[PDB]
Design a protein around this ligand. Sequence first.
Ligand code: NAP
Length: 307
Amino acid sequence: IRFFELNTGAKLPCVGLGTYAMVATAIEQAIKIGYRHIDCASIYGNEKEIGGVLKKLIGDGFVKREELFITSKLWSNDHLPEDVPKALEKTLQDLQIDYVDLYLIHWPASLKKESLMPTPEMLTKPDITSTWKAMEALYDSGKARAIGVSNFSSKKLTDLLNVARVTPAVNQVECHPVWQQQGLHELCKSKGVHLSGYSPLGSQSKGEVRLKVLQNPIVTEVAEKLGKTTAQVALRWGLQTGHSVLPKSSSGARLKENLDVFDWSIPEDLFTKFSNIPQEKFCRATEFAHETHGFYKTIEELWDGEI
Ligand SMILES: NC(=O)c1ccc[n+]([C@@H]2O[C@H](COP(=O)([O-])OP(=O)(O)OC[C@H]3O[C@@H](n4cnc5c(N)ncnc54)[C@H](OP(=O)(O)O)[C@@H]3O)[C@@H](O)[C@H]2O)c1
């Protein structure tokens, strides 16, 4: 009851640690508190720090490698087939592990090799078939025990599924009460792809965007009625909707709080109330589209209208 089974047979722990903007001390505290699933990415710039933490905790016998589920992601400048395996090798060196449990294509949009941050002149025409074939080679050599995608629309996931030899195990997408992804859940379920919810508390976007989740009136009502925090309700909502959740916190207290989502539930009469929450996507990926210089000319193209 505390995992989702992937199409490879692997067990993905229901709650993963979000590591964007996290420092080593908080990652170590999270594992001590009980996190086993760790959501990483090369672009977060902290994989080396994370590797130091994993090396220490595994070395001390706190956890065995097999108790952890480590995800990383292929950044958009590394989409070309020659670069894919080099990117994972760097990630494995930094994380001080021999394999990741899950490796994801971070975005369906590609960038020139020389670039790191997405800018219009750096956008390139993607070739997800070729990138996926390279991902499949990493799966075949056990460097990534499962392979998947992130930020793929229903259409882009369908298009990949139509060419893939190895079915993507996971599609990691923004998902929270303000962006519920009902249609994509249906598609993923029907194809045996696990949907994993990023930014489950409403994201780290500036201007307190996350308050649209953490202080939504329905979320707040349900929290009051159940005697739980709004973060707890948002996370439990996600689990009950059938996706994993990847909450990030730099606070030990909040890390602990965010794991207390198993021993209680949201009753159906309250769960149904979430259907009336206004819907908005917070991670809009404007940086991966451009009218003149982009492959995707608009974000509506990038998301195939799922925005
Ligand atoms: N694949 C992708 O393109 C993609 C995109 C976005 C995110 N992700 C992944 O998803 C993870 C989570 O998303 P996210 O980092 O955007 O943020 P999030 O998990 O939605 O929310 C984090 C924010 O909420 C605060 N918070 C955490 N627990 C709280 C609690 N119990 N009560 C009140 N506030 C709380 C955090 O602040 P404090 O740290 O100050 O507590 C932080 O500002 C990321 O770290 C990353 O691993 C992936």
